[PDB]
Amino acid sequence: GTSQWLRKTVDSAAVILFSKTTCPYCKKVKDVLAEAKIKHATIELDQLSNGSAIQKCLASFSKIETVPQMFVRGKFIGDSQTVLKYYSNDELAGIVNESKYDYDLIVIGGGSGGLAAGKEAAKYGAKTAVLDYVEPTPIGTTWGLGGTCVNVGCIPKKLMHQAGLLSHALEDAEHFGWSLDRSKISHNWSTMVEGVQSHIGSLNWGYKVALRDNQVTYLNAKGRLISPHEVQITDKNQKVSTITGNKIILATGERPKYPEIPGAVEYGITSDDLFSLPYFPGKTLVIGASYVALECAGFLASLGGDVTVMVRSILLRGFDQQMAEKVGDYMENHGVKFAKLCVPDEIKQLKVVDTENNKPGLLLVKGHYTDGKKFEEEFETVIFAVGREPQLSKVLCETVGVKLDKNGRVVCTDDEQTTVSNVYAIGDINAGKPQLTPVAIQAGRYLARRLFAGATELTDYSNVATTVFTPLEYGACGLSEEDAIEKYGDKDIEVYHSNFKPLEWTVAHREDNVCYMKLVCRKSDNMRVLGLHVLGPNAGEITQGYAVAIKMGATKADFDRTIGIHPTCSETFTTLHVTKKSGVSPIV
Amino acid sequence: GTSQWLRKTVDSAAVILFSKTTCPYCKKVKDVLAEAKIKHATIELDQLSNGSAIQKCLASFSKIETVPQMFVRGKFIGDSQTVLKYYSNDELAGIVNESKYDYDLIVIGGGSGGLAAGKEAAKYGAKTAVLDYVEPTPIGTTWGLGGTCVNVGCIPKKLMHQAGLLSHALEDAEHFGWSLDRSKISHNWSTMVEGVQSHIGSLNWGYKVALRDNQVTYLNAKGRLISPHEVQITDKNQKVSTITGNKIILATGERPKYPEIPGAVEYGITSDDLFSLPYFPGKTLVIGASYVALECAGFLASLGGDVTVMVRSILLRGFDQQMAEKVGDYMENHGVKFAKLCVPDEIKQLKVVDTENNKPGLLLVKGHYTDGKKFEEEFETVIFAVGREPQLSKVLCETVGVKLDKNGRVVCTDDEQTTVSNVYAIGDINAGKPQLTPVAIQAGRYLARRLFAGATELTDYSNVATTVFTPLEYGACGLSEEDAIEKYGDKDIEVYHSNFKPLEWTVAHREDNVCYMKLVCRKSDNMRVLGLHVLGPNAGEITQGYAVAIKMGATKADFDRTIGIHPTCSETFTTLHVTKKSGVSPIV
Ligand SMILES: Cc1cc2nc3c(=O)[nH]c(=O)nc-3n(C[C@H](O)[C@H](O)[C@H](O)COP(=O)(O)OP(=O)(O)OC[C@H]3O[C@@H](n4cnc5c(N)ncnc54)[C@H](O)[C@@H]3O)c2cc1C
Ligand SMILES: Cc1cc2nc3c(=O)[nH]c(=O)nc-3n(C[C@H](O)[C@H](O)[C@H](O)COP(=O)(O)OP(=O)(O)OC[C@H]3O[C@@H](n4cnc5c(N)ncnc54)[C@H](O)[C@@H]3O)c2cc1C
């Protein structure tokens, strides 16, 4: 075990120092490297249980069993006197810069995963380049550094969600004694967009500054992997060049899909366009039933939009379907219209977007319900949210030897390795992984640490918590009820559940018995919590802490023993008692 | 172990059935009892690991080793044929009603603990009485069933806190694109109070209905324990009577303290009066620095009040003092004035409350700072929040033999037993216990289950999470940093920390580097999380889930492995890295 680990660590690390905490010579080297501004990984052997065995194994690489020992790109470069010799002769900078390739790491993609990986690698002295390019949407929308989440995803989505929530805070205010004339209050889409875009702008800038401060080379360039170590780059002027890298991280993410219908690409928009849209969507049709579809429909309705969601089959496929129905029901009860069992056939333009008064155009949507009745209705904006897709034909040459699955995603090992051994893939393009920002970030940081700092820790992709930021939010961690039943059998599953009502909703005169939570548990495994689900306000804040407990293997008894904080929504998880099998009502 | 448990269970249970899940005769008895509307505890022996040993030990009580076996108040009453005999002869109701005392349980106090205990006991066939009386405040304020939390505590406090938070939602709305004229918006205290009081009214009613539905006798009467089994009751007409009970639960809670200064009782108010106050407090002085003091000062300021807090020494004594300072700093930065190192000497009336126009009076507060400078300032309302005290001289005769500590609180065993063996104490009057609503409720339910259903489970009073609902909320679970250092030594404590900024605050233009979180960890115990602390919005929702993980013995590694939900405030706990010892800035 130790021999394998040390071999991999020496082979892969860009600059690494083997040391001990109580070592005066190790400190001398550390001080020299710090003065010379040489970043590096450090392994303190006296902080590892196999540290003595590691010390002895180092002689297979250096011929010595003492500390300190410094390595650069797979080669022992010296002990304490040797490093200080390089230093006094002005040879040290040259030695630590010596490389077969232009970079130790090239990251293709400057999004959630790629930026996380690139910054983390640079910390340990890996010579790093991050490439980012944003291919314009069909209408021409583009954006700056940071990826999907920062520019056209989690960040602007949640900010618009908040603008939506404030709509209802305005109503609630009156019941709590605030005197205001709601009939004279309106929302300005464009003002909201400007505020959101200003914040996104500060993030674009912040990431650029961060890369500079970490000595990462940032290239606003389209990258193409043409061989295992060669990346072809195309800049803004269309000038083509080649750079070389030892390790390659593919982190190019996905883009929205369009349905294959006449008028879709020409007249429809996606989430890519929505978050910087210069005009008010107005009367909107959202085609799709993904978490993106419902989130966007939701905030658009709360901002006073006339909103219809066209649903082919079900909502939130892959999510707990009881919870998905509850999410949909709340939206429907609050004005979101659902065109159920309906598919679109054709989109026709009736009016072009007014680019001077910033007003939407007008569209005619033609379709049909499964019952054969025709759908024909005018909408000012049509948004497609029918899923997202990798675009690796734009990123990798087929002769490189990176294997993709049927969906065009990269087939990876549990340490993100592709079929090309120096090439790794993280984030949304990694086949089978939850497609979320903190997952991409964790994967990128953990990978960079394994590659360049001798870490062993893999990213745990199991029981990753999620939150859907619909008008009433839905948080989950672990298995849906249906998945747990399929896996373990109905007889081995117990479900504890309850409705609840936020205290805030009482004076506000909001719904009884709408907010809902459940714990899906395994009877034969000490009532192990397999899945946690909550529909309610601040569901992400509620859910997060429980994800740690679930990771640790929480049982129903652990929940029972723990005391609630009052008054909160979350405390309801501490006193659950009604089982589904008992048939008792979950109402309170 | 088994013999001791069975002896206690038989001795204490009011009505109990020993049974097995696959037992046709046990079902016959169950059906008979259900038809006769006889509530009872049930112990299923085939669901206990020592069930076979229990079956054999039952013969020491009944002379038989078979199931079913039914017991009433310490006596075996029969097997299956015997119970059905009583049933067919119309003797069963008489047998299960036969008792030495009027009640199996008398609960003195109809608050958080008492109602929880009384309702839970009734479920297992304990003949139960709940006594509640609300002694008026010096100005005459009184309220209905439910206790401190329901009427003059957590419920109205959090509702007023929400009215306060809505103040700032109104400001935020503008930055998110909402068009409104804030210069024309004002708050009406009385309208808010009416809304809050209507909700409290529904809770008063709900609890009364709940007791009726559970067949609990509710007496709106002042109770006095005059001997171990005798409770003297005084009704509204001042008629005095005596009732007897087997088990007694003392759950009488606490009332606000007044400082011993001229004018305090005559002209000041407390939290007891504040939540139904018919007039606007106006320019207010809050005397005290408890969580109650700061919470009330906080919402009063957000509702446009001119608010001063008079602080003798420190804020939130007993809470983490770094966090307490941060809580105070936020309040001070947002308009709450603090009269530091200042004590009050005298309160003089300048104007009487206008009882027709519902306007406050006016007061003159005279005091002095520790530097000798005089304090002399006019306030419309003076609120004391200088702590709370038990009042058991109003509840128990000294000859009963219940031991109290120096503070007047009841000295209890770890199963809530007093020095009088049939007498128990729960909630705020139980010496040394965290004084919180869910603690009282857990204690009451768990006690009732041990007394009447053979449960063994004790209430766990360790690592009980809390939340202070100040303008910026403070959630905690476990040890303060100072307490952990005192207990384990500075060398054994590592503190991970970070500032954060809610995404919601970006567009709203609120503070950077004000929200804050830390994990206080023990180095020698695998970096065990000893204390969790968060200053930020929805801090109770953030904190709760982590309390389960902490209960289970979470380490820093468990936090690290767990993936964040984005975008949330809580996710910041999943990626903490800056230690206090490193001296690196926690800023982001
Ligand atoms: C509307 C929406 C809302 C979402 N909300 C949430 C949420 O609330 N919480 C959450 O956790 N997740 C959310 N997500 C998902 C989250 O955005 C993604 O999981 C995350 O951004 C994936 O990061 P990544 O590194 O894999 O790819 P990305 O962030 O997409 O970054 C890839 C980058 O590489 C660039 N690129 C592509 N090809 C090349 C090339 N050839 N050369 C150079 N650069 C290239 C891309 O243009 C892009 O900039 C949301 C997604 C969407 C669409
Ligand atoms: C302003 C304030 C805010 C608070 N906020 C929170 C919070 O946010 N979260 C939280 O967890 N806790 C909070 N608390 C604490 C919480 O209110 C108490 O911990 C809880 O109410 C204690 O319940 P209890 O059963 O011990 O007593 P109580 O709820 O006080 O009930 C005791 C009842 O018995 C009655 N009684 C007294 N003597 C007799 C007698 N002789 N005969 C008959 N009846 C009698 C009393 O009048 C009272 O009705 C707050 C407290 C205050 C004061």
- The CATH architecture classification of the largest domain in chain A is 3-Layer(bba) Sandwich
Q: What assembly state would you assign to the polypeptide chains in this entry?
A: homodimer
Top-tier CATH class of the largest domain in chain A: Alpha Beta
Global shape of chain A: globular
* CATH superfamily label of the largest domain in chain A: FAD/NAD(P)-binding domain
Q: Report the end-to-end length of chain A measured between terminal Cα atoms.
A: 56 Å
Protein name (chains A, B): thioredoxin-disulfide reductase (NADPH)
Family (chains A, B): Belongs to the class-I pyridine nucleotide-disulfide oxidoreductase family.
Keywords (chains A, B): Calcium, Disulfide bond, Electron transport, FAD, Flavoprotein, Metal-binding, NAD, NADP, Nucleotide-binding, Oxidoreductase, Redox-active center, Selenocysteine, Transport
Organism (chains A, B): Schistosoma mansoni
